[PDB]
Write a protein that binds this ligand. Structure first.
Ligand SMILES: Nc1ncnc2c1ncn2[C@@H]1O[C@H](COP(=O)(O)OP(=O)(O)O)[C@@H](O)[C@H]1O
Lengths: 49, 49, 41
């Protein structure tokens, strides 16, 4: 399994043989923008399983 | 046991052997120690498998 | 010519090994490339 890793997640940065099924989180840095054109940078985390 | 003019066969065990006049020793072998859940891949060169 | 598959085999009389050619660049895909699923870079 070739997987995405990094702060601003890039594809093909990690390789594995087992799929971690279990409850973890991963964290991403986004860039959004408002109806006012205020450019915002966000730190988010995703709890998954 | 009867053998033919080109055969091979393994002799094993606790015993004492003298070669016949029409037998050749070609090799010495050791049993390979293996624990449960451990192994090796063997090929049967006669049948290919 | 035929493909003979599966068991240990001795070429009988009047039989010879036959070389099979591959079109330009096919070999790289078969070995250098191999699985496309495992890596895509
Ligand atoms: N062998 C694996 N199988 C499945 N998922 C994995 C494996 N190794 C890592 N991961 C997941 O992939 C994500 C990679 O992102 P990562 O850079 O670790 O995020 P973070 O910045 O939060 O550490 C991680 O959340 C991790 O849980």
């Amino acid at each position: 399994l070739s997987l995405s890793a990094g702060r601003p997640k890039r594809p093909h940065a990690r390789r594995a043989l087992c799929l971690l099924l279990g409850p973890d989180f991963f964290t991403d840095v986004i860039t959004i923008e408002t109806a006012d054109h205020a450019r915002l940078q966000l730190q988010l985390a995703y709890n998954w399983h | 046991v009867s053998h033919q003019a080109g055969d091979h066969w393994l002799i094993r065990g606790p015993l004492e052997y003298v070669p016949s006049a029409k037998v050749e020793v070609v090799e010495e072998r050791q049993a390979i120690p293996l624990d449960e859940n451990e192994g090796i891949y063997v090929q049967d060169v006669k049948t290919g498998k | 010519v035929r493909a003979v598959i599966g068991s240990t085999y001795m070429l009988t009389q009047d039989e010879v090994l036959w070389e099979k050619e591959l079109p330009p660049g096919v070999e790289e895909l078969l070995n250098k490339g191999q699985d496309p699923l495992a890596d895509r870079g």
